[PDB]
Amino acid sequence: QPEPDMITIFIGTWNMGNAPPPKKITSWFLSKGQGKTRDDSADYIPHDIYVIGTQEDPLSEKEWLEILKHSLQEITSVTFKTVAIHTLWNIRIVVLAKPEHENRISHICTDNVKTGIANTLGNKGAVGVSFMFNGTSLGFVNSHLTSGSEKKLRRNQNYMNILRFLALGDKKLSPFNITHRFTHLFWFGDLNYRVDLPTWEAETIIQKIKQQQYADLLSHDQLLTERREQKVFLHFEEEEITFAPTYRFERLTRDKYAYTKQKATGMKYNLPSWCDRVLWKSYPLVHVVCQSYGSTSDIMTSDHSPVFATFEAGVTSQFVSKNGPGTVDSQGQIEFLRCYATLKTKSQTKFYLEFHSSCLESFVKSQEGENEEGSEGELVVKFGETLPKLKPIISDPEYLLDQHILISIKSSDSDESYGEGCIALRLEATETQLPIYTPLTHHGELTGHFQGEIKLQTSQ
Numbered sequence: 001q002p003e004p005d006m007i008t009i010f011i012g013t014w015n016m017g018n019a020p021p022p023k024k025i026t027s028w029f030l031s032k033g034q035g036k037t038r039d040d041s042a043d044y045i046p047h048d049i050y051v052i053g054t055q056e057d058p059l060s061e062k063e064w065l066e067i068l069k070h071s072l073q074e075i076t077s078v079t080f081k082t083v084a085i086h087t088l089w090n091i092r093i094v095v096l097a098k099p100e101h102e103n104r105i106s107h108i109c110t111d112n113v114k115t116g117i118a119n120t121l122g123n124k125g126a127v128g129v130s131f132m133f134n135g136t137s138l139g140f141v142n143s144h145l146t147s148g149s150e151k152k153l154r155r156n157q158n159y160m161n162i163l164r165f166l167a168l169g170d171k172k173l174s175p176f177n178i179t180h181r182f183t184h185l186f187w188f189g190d191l192n193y194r195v196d197l198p199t200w201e202a203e204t205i206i207q208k209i210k211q212q213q214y215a216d217l218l219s220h221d222q223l224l225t226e227r228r229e230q231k232v233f234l235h236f237e238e239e240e241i242t243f244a245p246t247y248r249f250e251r252l253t254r255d256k257y258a259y260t261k262q263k264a265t266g267m268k269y270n271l272p273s274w275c276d277r278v279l280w281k282s283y284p285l286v287h288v289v290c291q292s293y294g295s296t297s298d299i300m301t302s303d304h305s306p307v308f309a310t311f312e313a314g315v316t317s318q319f320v321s322k323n324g325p326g327t328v329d330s331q332g333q334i335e336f337l338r339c340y341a342t343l344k345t346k347s348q349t350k351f352y353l354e355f356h357s358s359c360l361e362s363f364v365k366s367q368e369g370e371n372e373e374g375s376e377g378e379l380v381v382k383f384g385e386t387l388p389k390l391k392p393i394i395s396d397p398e399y400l401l402d403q404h405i406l407i408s409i410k411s412s413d414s415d416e417s418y419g420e421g422c423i424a425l426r427l428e429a430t431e432t433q434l435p436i437y438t439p440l441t442h443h444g445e446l447t448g449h450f451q452g453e454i455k456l457q458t459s460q
């Protein structure tokens, strides 16, 4: 029975509005409704992994698991296994997998982050799950961010707190946050970004939605504009939105957007918005393709519609050679040549690098670099040809070309990371000096760049 090199992943996000779901929610898991929808000819084909995020979820874990599992068994005639379930207040994540994957999944982690302080602490935050699928690390975050049209900056702050403090994946990757710990990271939820148009324009917006003319609305979507300005979700992807705003509906129909201010809303307007979103970030040159992104039309218990997204995702096998794991394979080597980091910092410490990768027996510390001043005010840290030669556990190019090297640049004075990035070993050539590049971030914000050349020796 061969190990897969691709899987498909279902991501759902639904703010349930504190109401029990209707009796049938199968359209959600089938990617049917509005937007980029799934072909009918696929309806019986199970996804490999289903990841369900809810917000304002009124059900117990047991109650929701029974609905989810029996929904999937009805669609697929497969009884899924529960990988993980984690709940913070009314924010929940469920991961379900086909039974054939049970012994391919390991290292399951769960965590949550509570956002805000005093007043603003007690209902918003995030839950997440990570695990290994054979050789591939997968991370999933369901966040419910701060509400309100005039709180985009708070949402951005919530995002940074979640990626800083959510403790998922390999704890040995100590310099790295969740935006670098996984081959594939999916981040979804009620992100609560709004369409920023004047309140007076509510009926105009509704008109546009009824005509399926979303372009003049999406140009004012706060998540797209904040992403464009590099204020949030740096280096993440989102499929094009081709479905109607998913909030705020009158319950029990989808014919009416309920946008006017009420005591129940704190006297706030809720103009129609794409609150409910799926984004992802995968390591460079790993296969990931969005095959659906849309909303259901027939699930109407909430003031939000459910959102679905599905992905093809590249995965790798748990590789064994006669040498590694358990030793190095001297027919393999990774040389980082003529490298330099460009940093936005004003500090004047010396810096060193750490190289982290599951192709190494443990992380590798470099010597300190040589600081120079850049022509436009910057710090340039030069490493020359000084960098340690990295010794992979397995030399086989079928393994090594699928790997990645995480890089942290750390202060000698504090040992704190000033920037993190990732280099793919999916090179155009071996035994050949080739350019490499990564942006560097810290707490998810751009702090610099790392560039130079690589020379990879494999057994072939």
Ligand SMILES: CN1CCN(C(=O)c2ccc(F)c(F)c2)CC1
Pocket: 081, 082, 083, 084, 097, 101, 102, 103, 105, 106, 108
């Ligand atoms: C509640 N727990 C029970 C223990 N548990 C597993 O045994 C498990 C391991 C791998 C899988 F893929 C899977 F679906 C399940 C995870 C959930």
Ligand SMILES: CN1CCN(C(=O)c2ccc(F)c(F)c2)CC1
Pocket: 227, 228, 229, 236, 237
């Ligand atoms: C297919 N990908 C390639 C990478 N990518 C961008 O470079 C990007 C361009 C414009 C943006 F507003 C933004 F937020 C990001 C996202 C799309």
